[PDB]
Ligand binder design. Structure first.
Ligand SMILES: C[C@H](CCC(=O)NCCC[N+](C)(C)C[C@H](O)CS(=O)(=O)O)[C@H]1CC[C@H]2[C@@H]3[C@H](O)C[C@@H]4C[C@H](O)CC[C@]4(C)[C@H]3C[C@H](O)[C@]12C
Ligand SMILES: C[C@H](CCC(=O)NCCC[N+](C)(C)C[C@H](O)CS(=O)(=O)O)[C@H]1CC[C@H]2[C@@H]3[C@H](O)C[C@@H]4C[C@H](O)CC[C@]4(C)[C@H]3C[C@H](O)[C@]12C
Ligand SMILES: C[C@H](CCC(=O)NCCC[N+](C)(C)C[C@H](O)CS(=O)(=O)O)[C@H]1CC[C@H]2[C@@H]3[C@H](O)C[C@@H]4C[C@H](O)CC[C@]4(C)[C@H]3C[C@H](O)[C@]12C
Ligand SMILES: [Zn+2]
Lengths: 72, 52, 1337
């Protein structure tokens, strides 16, 4: 066991679970929505080409990010 | 024992480091064996549950 | 230019980065800190002066008397460190304190004193820290570890969503003072700001803003922005406010600005700001949700239409509008950025004014008592704004001002209204998203104490205890003839310091395994201890490494196990601030040029700068060579332009600690392997003969010198006389200090016992008539080698399986390593025979021992003690002691036996001191201690006359060496100007202190040196007298002990299976076999491999550093063996100079340069002879040898570039397929020995209350068969195994003896009875009121 091999397993699980959470948050494959689900605005072309399947424009997205930063 | 403590607390201060039992028996009037047994009288032994 | 002890053996050094800041004195913490403590602070702010100024001047009851502190000094001790360790006491100094007492009459309060009295009273002894930062507290050597505790100031921390179900984070700000109450602000889940004063009941936060005499209009002016509407129903507009999801659309001048419902955006914000829109119009319904800002009344009756913080509805809008009201002010309470919190808190806030708020505070603090206006106001003002009850210290105010981002590092000590309003704004701002919480393991919140500050605190505690008694004694009588000696008894002042230095979690035995262990144990920071967190409450919080640890704490080095991250080690260049916060040096970077001067930055400042990397290439003018240089800003590391960077790391090593700086190729190891490797280097016991690492770093000389193991010169000179015990140096005449005699003596520390029973022993390095320069080492300490730290030995290791003999982590050691005594360690252990006086008389150290039959008494001399020179084994009698006793009525058949043989009873036990089992050493020493009552025995008078002759000889031999040196200097003075050069030797040496010379200042010199030798004579005389007094004077032994005989058994432990070898890269093992040398793998030249290793350990444990080290050691040894071949065939120094100089410049642009061309032809032969075992090599920690230079250095020898040679099997001699890796790894013998562990017991001692076998190997104890072993036995069917482990082998006092009788009878059956543990349980339940019993069978 050596006490660093188990530490290795712990670190491996920690990094992998973090990596895959931050990957699942991407949702690359998606739907062409074409209009914001918050303000109905035109989600500009470049943002839909970068993130296929967005649901918020950058303004509503950053807004939501602030709140989910604090919590709730 | 209270008198021994008093005389020692005074003598250590006035005499320097500490009173050796010959010095206490001289300063006191005791025969210096009584003083030694008074010193050897144990004190408040200990809780046997003390940590190690 | 190379030091003369440096040209002896030059470690070749990779590490292309040029070194700018040379490594500090590694023990600066301990020594600096204890310097500040016991030292005459003239402007008293440090150490004893501050404590004395803080208690004094004491003033008497009604000011009749004043006890005033004049000054202190430290009386010189009674014994030095060696004498303290022998005698067994704390090496301290008396604290003699000159005090003054002035007494006043009537009508002269400050007026003329009736009389004063001066006297130097003695208040306790402070232990003295030795020259290494260690104390001697009870004869043993302690180290006081530095502590790491939170500092005063304001801390912003959140629950990070754990507490509330929704997850909503709740931010609190805490003002922790130095002394005083803990103001704390914290959010409610409804986002109401509360304040609690001492972890007491929660109050609304604005209750305290009213307590500071504010009103609601003022509070809303402080915390909010006034959206001002005017008049219709027009809105003044700040376009930045409406960032946006926008309520009303937006319009001005009638055309349009934005249409409603769609979210407000940056483009439309641009449009409003561009078209200069100040006033727009909103309806009568949008103003229905805002909050009124201030008072609004009717002029008709002077009646209040609406207060402040009151909701504004359409009715009130109409009512104000009809009052001719054009202006209205509303709180700008956004939901995301400018959140409304003071508004809701003022809602919940029941009070209104300072009176009712103070009453609320009073009820919370002093509850139930009927309050008053005056009592409430007084309590509140005494909370935070009375100077005698609330203190932000200098650290506290520094952190409070800096944490609020103010530029006033210095300030008051009490809070203020503004120091609370800024705290509340910062709290609300953290909640608004501008700003972040504090990290707890952030090293800007935690500061370090050390010996100076902790001891000063204990001394202040003692001083307050003194102040009590002195005030009361100046209360009673105050009569004359009462002086400042009777009022102060030294016991309770010295009591706290004694209790701390002896009995504290931080005063702990220094680890002396080897020098590196001491250097790390002194440079240690601890989060534990009295004042810091406890192991139970820690976390999960401060075990973690934090970005502010860069350059301050070693991320590698820390114990694994119960406290990871609770005990870190100080980094290499880490330092302590003025205030106590850790810091680290950076070379300042002007515009692009990397300036040379260096500033120390602490974790608070280090964030807001941009700090380049130490491995950043540069031009010669100091510019960077890369456009985007990778530097770490506040928390992260990114590529910044070369213009932006402000500071740069002082070195590549500055992130590690001195332990983990000794791992070569540390960059190639997984970080935890580095942790284990460092922690195991701390445990390497020093071998019999030292061996420097063939692959080091260049840290070894620093660790060896800066610790006190090696005797270093103080002044250059010549080695007048060497010896196994002493080195005499005749100084260069440049460094004589004209009063001095010239020569200085170093007395080596011979075979002595360290805390771990190892042998500390210094060996001379220099030889007769050889130069030295100040800073050169004269004596190699334990586990150093020619000045360098040499922990273990460099072995010719092979990596390959070999027959399951290095299977899990085992090691397969050759018999040749066992023959060369490479890992043989001298251990030393002291065994004490205490003869006390029992209640039937005293016990004797006699040799007329009972039954033992004149063979065991063969070693013992007449007085009963073993000879210094005898080799005992386990069981031999070191000290024969016979004890009194009674008769005890020997049973019949013993009566009958002694009646048949007439061997009458002894009456005297044989309670003597025999050697413990398994040890077999030489008795190297014997000390005796007789109390002043007990006369002495023959051995005691013998040892005393021997110590007497030694002391006299030492003093005289020193004095005559010094006299001969001073006569040489006097004769050099007598060469001109009143000169006698050929008759100077004619008259006798003693007729030279009366020598004539012309009337100059140099006949003055002769007379001066003469009278100074007279000083030598007389002070030598008083030295001899005091020495004879100390040697002869009786000892102050503990109460009741007549005398203590201490034998010192020196054992020599050899390597054996079960011993634990280990590498510097976390590769630890356990010798499983000691292979015969012809059974080991050999190469094609006949060379067995010294040690065989498992290649399996390397891939999974990602420490390939041991592989690169094996390759580099193969290269180094290849170089050195080529040198040995040249040096043995007597190749001329042409050949040696050529080859050695070709090997000393290898690698791409290394910093080091050596030119053997500027080398004496004898200094190349010495250097060659030292490089004939192998060329030492250095590899700085993140700077060292690239693999291609390893390959080149292999090509320099005739070794293969691949590093893998082909090996043959020892037993059969057929070549292993697919060649193996063999090089030189540097192994270390860890202090986990197999005979300090192997323990066994059939039947021995049994504990008194619970009749179980004793616990431990020292008690010859049994094994703890616990609960889980019992489940394992129940999971089989072993019903009998368990019944006998629990009954007969443990606790059943009557069945254990019957089992023994049966086993020797050859009848393996147990009648188990019943355990004593259950009997004691039954009696203990019965001694409660319960009646428990065992029914009829
Ligand atoms: C390290 C650990 C073995 C230790 C013994 C193994 C065993 C189960 C593994 C996780 C699970 O599969 C779920 C999840 C699946 C995703 O797809 C990838 C991520 C997750 C978190 C995995 C990480 C890691 O690999 C785990 C902890
Ligand atoms: C190890 C233990 C620390 C527990 C934490 C401390 C706490 C109290 C200590 C004993 C008492 O002082 C009495 C007695 C005084 C003699 O003079 C020296 C021996 C005795 C037996 C001491 C041994 C030891 O030092 C004790 C057990
Ligand atoms: C070489 C030097 C003369 C310099 C002109 C003389 C003067 C002082 C002498 C030492 C002392 O006597 C002490 C000691 C006495 C022992 O007996 C022999 C060893 C010692 C170390 C002596 C060696 C030598 O004799 C010394 C260094
Ligand atoms: Zn949108």
């Amino acid at each position: 066991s050596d006490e660093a091999d188990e530490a290795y397993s712990v670190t491996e699980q920690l990094t992998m679970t973090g990596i895959n959470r931050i990957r699942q948050k991407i949702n690359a494959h998606g739907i062409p929505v074409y209009l914001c689900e918050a303000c109905g605005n035109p989600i500009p072309e470049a943002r839909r080409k970068i993130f296929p399947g967005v649901t918020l424009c950058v303004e509503c997205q950053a807004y939501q990010e602030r709140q989910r930063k604090h919590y709730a | 024992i209270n008198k021994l403590n008093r005389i020692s607390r005074q003598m250590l201060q006035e005499m320097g480091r500490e009173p050796t039992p010959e010095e206490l028996a001289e300063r006191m009037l005791m025969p210096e064996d009584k003083i030694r047994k008074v010193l050897k009288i144990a004190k408040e032994p200990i809780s046997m549950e003390t940590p190690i | 230019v190379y030091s003369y002890t440096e040209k002896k053996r030059i470690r070749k050094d990779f590490g292309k980065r040029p070194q700018v800041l040379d490594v500090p004195y590694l023990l600066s913490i301990q020594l600096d800190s204890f310097q500040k403590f016991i030292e005459q602070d003239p402007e008293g702010q440090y150490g004893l002066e501050a404590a004395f100024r803080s208690v004094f001047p004491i003033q008497s009851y009604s000011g009749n008397s004043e006890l005033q502190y004049v000054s202190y000094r430290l009386g010189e001790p009674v014994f030095d460190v060696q004498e303290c360790q022998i005698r067994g006491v704390t090496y301290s100094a008396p604290l003699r304190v000159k005090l003054r007492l002035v007494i006043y009459e009537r009508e002269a309060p400050e007026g003329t004193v009736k009389d004063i009295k001066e006297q130097e009273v003695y208040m306790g002894e402070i232990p003295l820290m030795t020259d290494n930062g260690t104390f001697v507290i009870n004869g043993t050597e302690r180290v006081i570890v530095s502590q790491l505790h939170r500092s005063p100031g304001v801390f912003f921390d959140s629950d990070k969503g754990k507490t509330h179900s929704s997850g909503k984070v709740l931010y609190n700000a805490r003002i922790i003072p130095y002394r005083g109450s803990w103001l704390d602000f914290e959010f409610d889940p409804k986002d109401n700001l509360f304040v609690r004063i001492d972890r007491r009941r929660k109050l609304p936060a604005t209750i305290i803003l009213r307590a500071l005499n504010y009103t609601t209009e003022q509070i809303l002016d402080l915390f909010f922005e006034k959206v001002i509407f005017e008049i219709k129903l027009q809105m003044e507009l700040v376009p930045e406010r409406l960032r946006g999801t926008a309520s009303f659309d937006i319009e001005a001048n009638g055309k349009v600005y934005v249409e409603k419902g769609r979210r407000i955006t940056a483009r439309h914000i641009r449009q409003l700001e561009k078209d200069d829109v100040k006033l727009i119009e909103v309806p009568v319904e949008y103003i229905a949700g805002k909050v009124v800002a201030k008072d609004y009344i009717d002029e008709s009756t002077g009646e209040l239409i609406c207060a402040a913080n009151m909701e504004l509805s359409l009715d009130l809008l109409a009512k104000l509008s009809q009052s001719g009201h054009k202006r209205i002010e509303t709180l700008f309470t956004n939901d995301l950025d400018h959140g409304p919190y003071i508004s809701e808190t003022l809602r919940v806030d029941p009070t209104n004014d300072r009176l009712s708020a103070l009453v609320e505070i009073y009820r919370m603090m002093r509850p139930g008592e009927p309050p008053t206006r005056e009592a409430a106001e007084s309590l509140f003002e005494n909370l935070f704004f009375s100077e005698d009850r609330y203190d932000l210290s200098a650290v506290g105010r520094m952190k409070f001002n800096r944490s609020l981002l103010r530029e006033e590092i210095e300030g008051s000590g009490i809070l203020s209204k503004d120091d609370i309003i800024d705290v509340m704004k910062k709290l609300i701002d953290i909640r608004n998203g501008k700003g972040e919480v504090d990290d707890i393991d952030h090293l800007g919140n935690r500061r370090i104490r050390s010996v100076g500050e902790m001891a000063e605190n204990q001394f202040r505690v003692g001083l307050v205890r003194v102040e009590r008694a002195v005030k009361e004694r100046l209360s009673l009588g105050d009569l004359d003839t009462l002086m400042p000696q009777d009022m102060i008894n030294a016991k309770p002042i010295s009591a706290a310091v004694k209790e701390f230095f002896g009995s504290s979690q931080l005063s702990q035995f220094m680890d002396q395994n080897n020098p590196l262990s001491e250097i790390t144990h002194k440079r240690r920071i601890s989060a534990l201890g009295p004042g810091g967190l406890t192991r139970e409450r820690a976390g999960f919080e401060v075990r973690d490494v934090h970005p502010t640890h860069y350059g301050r704490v070693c991320p590698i080095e820390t114990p694994e196990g119960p406290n990871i991250g609770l005990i870190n080690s100080l980094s290499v260049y880490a330092q302590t601030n003025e205030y106590g916060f850790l810091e680290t040096p950076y070379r300042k970077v002007t515009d692009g040029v990397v300036t040379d001067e260096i500033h120390y930055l602490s974790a608070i400042e280090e964030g807001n700068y941009v700090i380049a990397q130490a491995n950043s290439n540069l031009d010669e003018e100091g510019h960077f060579v890369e456009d985007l240089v990778t530097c770490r800003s506040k928390g992260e590391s990114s590529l910044f332009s070369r213009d932006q960077v402000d500071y740069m790391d002082v070195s590549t090593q500055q992130v590690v600690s001195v332990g983990a700086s000794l791992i070569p190729f540390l960059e190639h190891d997984d970080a935890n392997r580095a942790l284990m490797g460092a922690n195991m280097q701390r445990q390497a016991v020093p071998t019999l003969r030292a061996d420097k690492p063939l692959v080091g770093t260049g840290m070894e000389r620093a660790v060896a010198v800066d610790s006190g193991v090696t005797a270093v010169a103080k002044r250059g000179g010549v080695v007048q006389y060497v010896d196994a015990s002493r080195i005499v140096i005749k100084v260069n005449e440049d460094e004589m200090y004209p009063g001095e005699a010239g020569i200085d003596i170093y007395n080596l520390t011979k075979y002595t016992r360290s805390n771990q029973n190892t042998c500390i022993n210094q060996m001379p390095c220099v030889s007769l008539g050889e130069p030295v320069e100040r800073g050169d080492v004269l004596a190699d300490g334990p586990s150093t080698d020619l000045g360098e730290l040499a922990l273990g030995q460099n072995m010719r290791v092979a990596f390959m399986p070999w027959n399951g003999y290095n299977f899990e982590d085992s090691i397969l050691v050759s018999e040749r390593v066992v023959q060369e005594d490479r890992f043989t360690t001298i251990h030393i252990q002291e065994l004490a025979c205490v003869s006390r006086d029992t209640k039937l008389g005293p016990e004797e150290i006699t040799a007329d021992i009972p039954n033992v039959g004149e063979a065991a008494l063969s070693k013992l001399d007449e007085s009963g003690i073993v000879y210094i020179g005898a080799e005992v084994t386990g069981g031999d009698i070191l000290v024969g002691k016979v004890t009194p006793k009674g008769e005890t009525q020997l049973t019949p058949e013993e009566k009958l036996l002694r009646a048949i043989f007439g061997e009458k009873a002894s009456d005297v036990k044989d309670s003597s001191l025999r050697v413990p089992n398994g040890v077999s050493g030489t008795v190297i020493d014997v000390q005796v201690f007789t109390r002043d009552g007990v006369e002495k025995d023959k051995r005691a008078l013998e040892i005393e006359e021997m110590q007497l002759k030694q002391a006299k000889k030492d003093l005289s031999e020193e004095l005559q060496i010094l006299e001969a040196g001073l006569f040489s200097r006097i004769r050099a003075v007598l060469v001109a100007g009143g000169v006698e050069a050929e008759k100077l030797d004619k008259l006798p040496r003693d007729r030279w202190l009366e020598l004539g010379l012309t009337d100059e200042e140099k006949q003055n010199q002769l007379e001066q040196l003469a009278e100074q030798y007279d000083e030598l004579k007389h002070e030598f005389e008083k030295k001899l007298e005091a020495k004879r007094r100390k040697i002869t004077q009786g000892d102050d032994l503990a109460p009741g002990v007549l005398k203590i005989v201490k034998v010192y058994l020196a054992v020599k432990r050899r390597i054996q299976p079960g011993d634990k070898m280990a590498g510097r890269h976390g590769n630890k093992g356990v010798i499983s076999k000691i292979n015969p040398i012809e059974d080991m793998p050999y190469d094609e030249n006949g060379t067995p491999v010294d040690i065989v290793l498992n290649p399996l350990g390397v891939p999974s444990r990602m420490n390939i550093g041991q592989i690169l080290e094996t390759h580099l050691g193969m290269a180094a040894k290849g170089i050195g063996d080529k040198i040995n071949a040249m040096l043995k065939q007597q190749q001329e120094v042409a050949k040696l100079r050529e080859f050695i100089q070709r090997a000393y410049d290898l690698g791409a642009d290394v910093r080091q340069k050596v030119d053997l061309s500027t080398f004496s032809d004898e200094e190349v032969m010495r250097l060659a002879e030292n490089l004939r075992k192998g060329m030492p090599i250095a590899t700085p920690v993140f700077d060292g040898a690239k693999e291609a230079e390893i390959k080149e250095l292999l090509k320099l020898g005739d070794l293969p570039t691949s590093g893998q040679i082909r090996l043959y099997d020892g037993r059969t001699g057929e070549q292993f397929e697919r060649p193996v890796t063999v090089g030189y790894m540097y192994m270390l013998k860890l202090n986990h020995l197999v005979d300090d562990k192997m323990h066994a017991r059939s039947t021995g001692s049994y504990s008194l209350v619970t009749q179980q076998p004793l616990g431990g190997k020292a008690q010859f104890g049994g094994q703890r068969f616990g609960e889980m072993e019992v489940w394992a036995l129940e999971a089989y069917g072993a019903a009998y195994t368990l019944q006998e482990m629990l009954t007969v082998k443990s606790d059943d006092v009557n069945g254990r003896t019957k089992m023994y009788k049966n086993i020797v009878d050859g009848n393996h059956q147990m009648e188990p009875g019943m355990p004593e543990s259950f009997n004691v349980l039954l009696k203990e339940i019965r001694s409660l009121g319960i009646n428990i019993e065992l029914e009829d069978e």
